[PDB]
Amino acid sequence: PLIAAASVIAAGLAVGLASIGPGVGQGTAAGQAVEGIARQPEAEGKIRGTLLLSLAFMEALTIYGLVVALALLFANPFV
Amino acid sequence: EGKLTVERDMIKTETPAFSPILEFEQDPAQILDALLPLYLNSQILRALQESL
Predict the structure, then answer these.
(1) Which stretches are annotated as coiled coil (chain B)?
(2) Closest Cα in chain A, distance from residue B22 (Å)
């Protein structure tokens, strides 16, 4: 049925449109991160502790995206 | 030998060129516009001290 086709193209565009934000996010984050480690390497414990704490939220955004896109592709109520 | 006299010291101050990173909080222009009046004042006070 065409509903499964719509669900598939939906999941495709879903996981595609998901990570443009998170990509540039992790990018500028890590860029300023290493350029700050250049200024002060003696903070790297909580450097990582904050870096990972932001990258965890970005990866949370995009795993939300991917897992929803899979929920469409996998066992789904409307198909 | 015995008298009073002045003897110059042509001391050359070594300069550590830059700090390892050397961030700026200001722009490269504003810092010079705020620094060169300070060196002007220093040179004026030196030209009063050596004149005196």
Answers:
(1) none
(2) 8
* Interface list for chain A against chain B, based on CB atoms closer than 8 Å: 38-39
Q: Which of A32, A34, A39 to mutate to test the interface with B (most CBs of B within 10 A)?
A: A39
Can you say whether the dihedral through the CA atoms of A42, A43, A49, A52 is positive or negative? negative
The rounded distance, in Å, linking the Cα atoms of B21 and B17 is 11
What does the angle CA A64 – CA A58 – CA A5 come to, to the nearest 5 degrees? 30
Please list the alpha-helical segments (H only) found in B1-52. Answer: 28-49
Q: Pull the structure tokens for residue A33.
A: 């991160």
Residues of B in contact with A38 (CB under 8 A): 21
Method: cryo-EM
Q: Taking CA atoms, what residue in B is nearest to A37?
A: B21
Cα dihedral B19, B24, B28, B31 in deg (nearest 10) = -90
